[PDB]
Amino acid sequence: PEASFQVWNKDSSSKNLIPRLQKIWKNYLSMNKYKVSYKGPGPGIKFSAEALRCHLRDHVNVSMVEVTDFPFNTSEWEGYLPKESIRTKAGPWGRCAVVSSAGSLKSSQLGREIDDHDAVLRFNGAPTANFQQDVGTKTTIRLMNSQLVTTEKRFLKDSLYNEGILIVWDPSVYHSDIPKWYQNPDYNFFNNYKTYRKLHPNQPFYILKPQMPWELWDILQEISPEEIQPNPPSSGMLGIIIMMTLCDQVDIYEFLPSKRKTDVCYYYQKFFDSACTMGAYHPLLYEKNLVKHLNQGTDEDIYLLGKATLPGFRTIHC
Ligand SMILES: *[C@@H]1O[C@H](CO)[C@@H](O[C@@H]2O[C@H](CO)[C@@H](O[C@@H]3O[C@H](CO[C@H]4O[C@H](CO)[C@@H](O)[C@H](O)[C@@H]4O[C@@H]4O[C@H](CO)[C@@H](O[C@@H]5O[C@H](CO)[C@H](O)[C@H](O)[C@H]5O)[C@H](O)[C@H]4NC(C)=O)[C@@H](O)[C@H](O[C@H]4O[C@H](CO)[C@@H](O)[C@H](O)[C@@H]4O[C@@H]4O[C@H](CO)[C@@H](O[C@@H]5O[C@H](CO)[C@H](O)[C@H](O)[C@H]5O)[C@H](O)[C@H]4NC(C)=O)[C@@H]3O)[C@H](O)[C@H]2NC(C)=O)[C@H](O)[C@H]1NC(C)=O
């Protein structure tokens, strides 16, 4: 007979959520922090995985702030941004993994498998020490939010960040261009970005353009059958899109949860929070519908391995 088990439900909505997280979702809708007014095609639209993958390649500009973008062409910013394009510095690569920071990675024994990709993406302060056998040992790209660069004093100190290519991103006002964003960043990380840059001139450190997270959000809101949190996508979703721009194959682990689904928010932290898996601030719930929708793997691969497989943009149709 055929096995019965549960993997992520592609049509997850707020009505599936715990009432606790339902109120939180509702409240973020209300305090429209980023002054979002969705004016696109309208809540709820169906795409084939082939078409949506191609609607994603075409309508999201994965690009980094360059020294041509005002005011990063001014004297104070001289020599601060990387000379070369990230695409020059990064691959293009063949096998790539995205390591989510979920607690569900604990005792998953993915460490060797994750190490067998040409390049590995991790987030924020997710550490390697003590976790090699569950998480891997290699860090090629690390995507971080601006809050960590602004406020985490460990960012300028801990030897871990000093591995691979770094990227910082910052939530802007909805549809804001670079100069408006620069004047009003969510966190003021510019000082610390500069200060790091002085410390490690050799290691490539990029700033994501503020437009990218909202371009991805538009598609989310357009897909979902209801209003999603008007806050940018999680680092995890942006990281998926990024690696898709740089890889043929992206294997993404414990984003879609395995059977090890747990309230433990992070593998390196000890505190419990269901919201880390299901979403509170980020529209994480709808991102996972998406990743589950584009998933080219089996449902068994999700149950056992927490593994989704999405193909990279380089290998797509029309
Ligand atoms: C992600 O990031 C993406 C990249 O940044 C981004 O994509 C960009 O989107 C923009 C839209 O938002 C889009 O902007 C348009 O740009 C047009 C010009 O582009 C050309 O120059 C830019 C320079 O930046 C370049 O990037 C682009 O590629 C174009 O270069 C051309 O490249 C061709 C390559 O294919 C090349 O052709 C090749 O040549 C080869 C030679 O061997 C070979 O032959 C190849 O086979 C051949 O293909 C070509 O030579 C070259 N051309 C040039 C000039 O360099 C603009 O035209 C356009 O502006 C118009 O539209 C906007 C609205 O969109 C209007 O506001 C604006 O006013 C313009 O409207 C025109 O207005 C004039 C004047 O009023 C009108 O003229 C009248 O016409 C009448 C009838 O004709 C009559 O004559 C009257 O007398 C005239 O007065 C005209 O009709 C109006 N047009 C229209 C349609 O109404 C616009 O700015 C940009 O191109 C995109 N970039 C890329 C790379 O795709 C993307 O948006 C980002 N994603 C997200 C989600 O944000």
Ligand SMILES: Nc1ccn([C@@H]2O[C@H](CO)[C@@H](O)[C@H]2O)c(=O)n1
């Ligand atoms: N329990 C968790 C914790 C985190 N995450 C994903 O991992 C990224 C890094 O924090 C987050 O941005 C999020 O995408 C997750 O899916 N589940």
